[PDB]
Design an enzyme around this catalytic site. Structure first.
Site, PDB file in Angstrom:
ATOM      1  CB  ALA B  34     -22.088 -62.365 -39.618  1.00 26.75           C
ATOM      2  CG  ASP B  35     -24.573 -66.611 -36.684  1.00 24.13           C
ATOM      3  OD1 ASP B  35     -23.696 -67.225 -37.327  1.00 24.13           O
ATOM      4  OD2 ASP B  35     -25.790 -66.875 -36.782  1.00 24.13           O
TER       5      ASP B  35
END
Ligand SMILES: CCCCCCCC/C=C\CCCCCCCC(=O)OC[C@H](COP(=O)(O)OCCN)OC(=O)CCCCCCC/C=C/CCCCCCCC
Lengths: 722, 77
Positions: B34-35
Site C-alpha cells: 500500500a501507500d
C-alpha cells in the site's frame, strides 16, 4: 438479467446488420445526396418580419424595380480610365441583362446617363459599377440561379482589351458561401476519418476493432444523412450549408462515441472474466440507456434551435434533430448487433490490460477532499468570463470565406478603386399621401438630405437634390431620368441613397441606422411631410435587425436546452439533484469554452468570432457535455451499494479511460471542422472542440464527482439509497 | 459472510491480493504494498462496507489487517 430488447438484438444480430446495410443502399441510390438536396432546398437568410426586409420589399414595390431583397452589383475594371470602348461593352451588357426578365428584375443603369455617370465612376476613373435587382430572396435556390444567370452573361460577353467584369453583392456572396460549404464537405470528412482512425488505432492497437467501429459510424452517418435528405427532398424542411456541415460532423462525432461506449464497456466486462454472452448483456445494461439518454439530449438540444428567429438558427433545428435520432437508433441496434457478431469470431476482445489504478487514485483525492476540489474547478471554469468585456462579434461575411471565391474577387476589385462602403449602400425612403414633385416639398427633400448628411459616419447621399451625391428645372430632359429614378412614378415617395464611411457591417455602421432614423424624423418635424413614413433598407439596416435578433435567440437556445436537457436527465436518472448537477456543471463550464474560443480566435489569431458561432456551439456543448456527465453519473447509480463514496471511486475507474477517449474523439471531430472553407463553421468546430476538452478533463473528472461526494445521499433524492 | 472475511475481501480487492494471500498480521505499507493513498481508499471502503466512521486520528492506527479487524469488532456492536 437479460433485458428483452437486448435478447432481440442478440437473436437477430445478423439481419439487423443487413437491414441497416440495405437501408443505406436505398438512401444512397434512390435519394439525392444531402449536399445536393440543400442546394435545391436552401432557405432565405432574413426573417420575413425584420423591418429591413419589409422595407426593402416596399422600396422595390413602390419604385416597381423588383420584389426580393436580393441585389447584385456588376463592377467593370480596366487598366486605363474607362473610355468609350468600355461604354459600348457596358451598354451591350446592360441590354443583355435587361432582356433576362426571369432573373434580372431591374437594372439600375446609372453609368449610361451622363447626368449621373460620375456618381458611380471611381475617382480614379478606372472603374464603374451597376446595381442589379435579382429575383428571389438572398440564399434561396432562385437567387442562386439568378446570380449564376447574371454571372454567365458577364463571362460569355467578350470584353475589350484589358477590361474585366465581376459580379458581387450579398446575394452573390450567399450563393458562393453555399457552394464553398458543400465543396469542402469531402475534405472535412476525409480529414475527420483519417484523424479518428489514427487516434482509435492507438487506443485499441487493433486495426479490425477500428475498421469495424468506423464502418458502423459510416452506416450511422449514411443513414442520418439519408433520412434528412429525404425530408428536404420532399419539401418538408429548409436547409443550409451550416446544417449539412454541422449534421455531418455531429453524426461522425456522436456516432463514434456510442461505439466507444459500447466497446469500452464490453471490453471492461471481458477483463472481469465474463463470457462473451454475459459480457454483451453487461454492456447493454450499462450503456443502452446512456446512449439513448445521450442521444435524446443532442436531438432535443439541437431541436431547441427551432425556436430561434434567425433562419440560420431556425432551420438548423429539425435537420439536426432528425439526424441525431436516426444516428442514435442505428447505434442502439447496429452497434450491439455488430458487437455480438464480431464477438462470435473473437474480434472485439481487449488487446491491453485496462488499468484503473490511475483513475481510482484520482477519484480517491476528489472524494476524500471534495470541497477544495470543487472550489478550484469552479474558479478555473469561471475565469473564462474575463474575456467577456473584450469580446467583439463580427458580421462581415467577406472575412469568413476564401479569398478566391467569385464574390470576394469582385469585392476586392471594388476596394482597389472605391471606398469599402460603395458596394453596401443604404436606401432611405419617405412615403406620404401628397405628390412631392412640387417645388415646395423639394425644399424639404433638400432639408432632409442635408440633415441625414449631418449624421456622423456617412460619406455621401444621392437624391434629386443631389444627383452627384454632393451639393452642386423640372423640364430638362436629363433631369427627367433622375426624376423617375429617385422619385416614385406616382410622386408619393422619394428615396435617398446613403453611403457610410467605413464598412457598414461594423458595429459602427449598425449604430448609424438609429441615428439616421432619428435624424430623418427630426428633419421632417415641423414640415409638410411631418406625417410621412420612413423605410430603411440595405446591409446596415439588415444587420441592425440581425444583431438584436441574434442576441435573444442565443438566450432562447441556451435556456430552452437547459430546461429540455434537465427534463431528459431527470427522466433518465430519476433523481432531481443528479439531473441538475449533470447539466448545471456543464452550464458553468460554458464560460471556460467561451474564454478559450475567444482567446484563440479574437486574440491569438486576430479573427473575431462570427455572430453565428456562440448560438451554434452553445447548443452542442450543453448537449454533449451533459452526456459525459450522464455516462459518469449513470455509473454511480450502478456502483452505489458498495458505498456512496466508494461507488464514485469504482465508477471513476471504470468510466475514466472510456470517457477520455470518447471525449477527445468528439473534440477532434469538431476541431477537424476547421478544415472547412467556411471560416464561420470552423470557428464553431473549434469552439465546441475546446469546450469538450475542458468538459472531459475538468467538469466530468473533478467537478461532478466532487459534488456527488459532497452531497451524499441527497444527490439521489428522492431515491432511497444508503 | 464473516466480518473478517469481508474485511480481507475489501483489502485484497483494493491491493490486488487474494483472500488466502492476505494475512492478519500483514501490514499494508510494508507487506501488501500500500501507500499513503491506498490506505485512504481502504479506510473509506471499510467505512462504507460496514457503515462506520474511522476518525482521521484513528485512521493512522490501522497499519495491519488485524488492527482494522480489532477496530471494527470493537465498533461493530
Ligand atoms: C430510424 C429507424 C430506426 C428503427 C429502429 C427503432 C429504434 C430502436 C432503437 C432503440 C430502442 C431500444 C434500445 C434503447 C434502450 C431501451 C431503454 C433502456 O435501455 O432504458 C430505458 C430507461 C429506463 O431507465 P433505467 O432503469 O435507468 O434503464 C436501465 C436499463 N437500460 O429509460 C430511459 O432511457 C428514458 C427514455 C426517455 C427519456 C426522456 C424523453 C423525453 C423527451 C425527449 C425529446 C427528445 C428530442 C426530440 C426531438 C424531436 C425532433 C422533431
Amino acid at each position: 438479467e437479460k433485458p428483452f430488447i437486448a435478447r432481440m438484438i442478440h437473436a437477430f444480430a445478423v439481419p439487423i446488420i443487413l437491414g441497416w446495410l440495405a437501408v443505406c443502399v436505398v438512401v444512397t441510390v434512390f435519394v439525392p445526396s444531402l449536399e445536393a438536396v440543400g442546394q435545391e432546398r436552401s432557405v432565405s437568410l432574413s426573417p420575413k418580419d425584420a423591418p429591413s426586409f419589409e422595407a426593402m420589399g416596399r422600396i422595390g414595390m413602390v419604385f416597381k424595380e423588383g420584389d426580393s431583397d436580393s441585389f447584385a452589383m456588376v463592377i467593370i475594371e480596366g487598366n486605363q480610365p474607362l473610355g468609350d470602348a468600355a461604354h459600348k461593352y457596358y451598354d451591350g451588357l446592360v441590354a443583355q441583362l435587361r432582356a433576362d426578365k426571369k432573373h434580372v428584375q431591374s437594372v439600375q443603369d446609372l453609368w449610361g446617363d451622363p447626368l449621373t455617370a460620375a456618381g458611380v465612376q471611381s475617382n480614379d476613373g478606372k472603374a464603374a459599377y451597376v446595381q442589379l435587382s435579382l429575383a428571389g430572396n438572398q440564399g434561396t435556390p432562385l437567387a442562386n440561379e439568378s446570380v449564376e444567370a447574371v454571372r454567365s452573361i458577364v463571362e460569355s460577353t467578350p470584353a475589350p482589351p484589358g477590361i474585366k467584369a465581376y459580379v458581387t453583392g450579398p446575394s452573390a456572396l450567399a450563393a458562393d458561401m453555399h457552394h464553398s460549404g458543400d465543396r469542402s464537405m469531402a475534405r472535412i470528412t476525409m480529414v475527420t476519418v483519417a484523424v479518428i482512425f489514427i487516434m482509435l488505432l492507438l487506443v485499441y492497437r487493433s486495426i479490425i476493432t477500428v475498421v469495424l467501429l468506423l464502418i458502423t459510424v459510416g452506416v450511422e452517418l449514411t443513414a442520418a444523412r439519408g433520412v434528412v435528405a429525404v425530408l428536404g427532398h420532399s419539401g418538408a424542411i429548409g436547409l443550409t450549408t451550416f446544417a449539412v456541415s454541422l449534421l455531418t460532423s455531429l453524426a461522425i462525432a456522436a456516432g463514434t462515441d456510442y461505439g466507444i461506449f459500447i466497446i469500452g464497456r464490453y471490453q471492461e466486462a471481458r477483463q472481469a472474466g465474463e463470457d462473451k454472452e454475459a459480457a454483451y448483456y453487461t454492456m447493454y445494461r450499462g450503456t443502452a440507456h446512456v446512449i439513448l439518454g445521450s442521444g435524446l439530449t443532442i436531438a432535443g438540444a439541437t431541436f431547441c434551435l427551432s425556436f430561434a428567429r434567425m433562419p440560420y438558427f431556425q432551420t438548423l433545428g429539425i435537420p439536426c434533430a432528425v439526424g441525431m435520432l436516426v444516428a442514435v437508433a442505428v447505434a442502439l441496434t447496429l452497434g450491439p448487433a455488430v458487437l455480438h457478431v464480431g464477438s462470435r469470431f473473437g474480434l472485439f476482445d481487449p488487446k491491453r490490460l485496462l488499468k484503473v489504478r490511475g483513475w481510482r487514485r484520482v477519484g480517491t483525492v476528489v472524494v476524500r477532499w471534495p470541497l477544495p476540489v470543487l472550489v478550484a474547478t469552479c474558479a478555473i471554469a469561471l475565469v473564462g468570463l474575463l474575456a467577456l468585456p473584450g469580446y467583439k462579434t463580427s458580421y462581415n461575411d467577406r472575412d469568413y470565406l476564401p479569398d478566391f471565391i467569385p464574390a470576394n474577387q469582385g469585392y476586392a476589385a471594388a476596394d482597389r478603386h472605391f471606398s469599402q462602403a460603395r458596394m453596401k449602400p443604404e436606401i432611405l425612403m419617405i412615403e406620404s399621401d401628397h405628390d412631392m414633385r412640387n417645388p415646395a416639398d423639394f425644399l424639404v427633400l433638400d432639408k432632409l438630405a442635408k440633415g441625414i448628411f449631418r449624421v456622423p459616419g456617412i460619406s455621401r447621399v444621392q437624391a434629386i437634390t443631389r444627383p452627384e451625391g454632393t451639393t452642386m428645372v423640372f423640364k430638362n430632359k436629363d433631369f427627367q431620368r433622375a426624376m423617375k429614378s429617385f422619385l416614385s412614378s406616382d410622386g408619393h415617395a422619394a428615396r435617398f441613397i446613403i453611403l457610410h464611411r467605413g464598412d457598414p457591417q461594423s458595429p459602427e455602421g449598425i449604430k448609424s441606422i438609429d441615428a439616421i432614423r432619428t435624424a430623418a424624423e427630426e428633419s421632417l418635424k415641423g414640415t409638410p411631410l411631418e406625417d410621412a413614413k420612413i423605410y430603411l433598407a440595405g446591409t446596415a439596416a439588415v444587420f441592425h435587425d440581425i444583431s438584436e435578433g441574434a442576441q435573444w435567440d442565443l438566450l432562447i437556445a441556451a435556456i430552452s436546452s437547459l430546461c429540455l436537457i434537465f427534463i431528459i436527465m431527470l427522466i433518465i436518472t430519476r433523481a432531481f439533484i443528479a439531473a441538475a448537477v449533470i447539466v448545471g456543471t456543464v452550464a458553468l463550464s460554458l464560460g471556460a469554452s467561451f474564454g478559450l474560443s475567444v482567446l484563440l480566435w479574437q486574440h491569438i489569431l486576430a479573427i473575431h468570432l462570427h455572430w453565428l458561432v456562440l448560438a451554434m456551439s452553445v447548443i452542442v456543448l450543453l448537449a454533449v457535455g451533459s452526456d459525459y456527465n450522464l455516462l459518469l453519473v449513470s455509473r454511480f447509480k450502478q456502483e452505489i451499494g458498495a458505498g456512496l463514496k466508494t461507488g464514485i471511486i469504482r465508477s471513476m475507474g471504470g468510466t475514466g479511460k472510456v470517457v477520455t477517449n470518447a471525449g477527445l474523439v468528439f473534440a477532434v471531430t469538431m476541431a477537424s471542422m476547421a478544415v472547412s472553407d467556411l471560416r464561420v463553421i470552423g470557428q464553431v468546430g473549434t469552439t465546441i472542440g475546446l469546450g469538450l476538452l475542458f468538459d472531459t478533463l475538468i467538469v466530468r473528472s473533478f467537478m461532478t464527482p466532487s459534488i456527488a461526494a459532497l452531497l451524499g445521499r441527497w444527490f439521489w433524492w428522492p431515491l432511497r439509497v444508503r | 459472510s464473516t466480518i473478517e472475511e469481508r474485511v480481507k475481501k475489501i483489502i485484497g480487492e483494493q491491493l490486488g491480493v487474494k483472500q488466502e494471500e492476505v494475512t492478519n498480521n500483514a501490514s499494508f505499507v510494508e507487506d501488501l504494498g500500500a501507500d499513503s493513498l491506498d490506505t485512504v481508499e481502504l479506510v473509506m471502503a471499510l467505512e462504507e462496507e460496514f457503515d462506520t466512521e474511522i476518525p482521521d486520528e484513528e485512521a493512522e492506527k490501522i497499519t495491519t489487517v488485524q488492527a482494522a479487524i480489532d477496530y471494527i469488532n470493537g465498533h461493530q456492536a
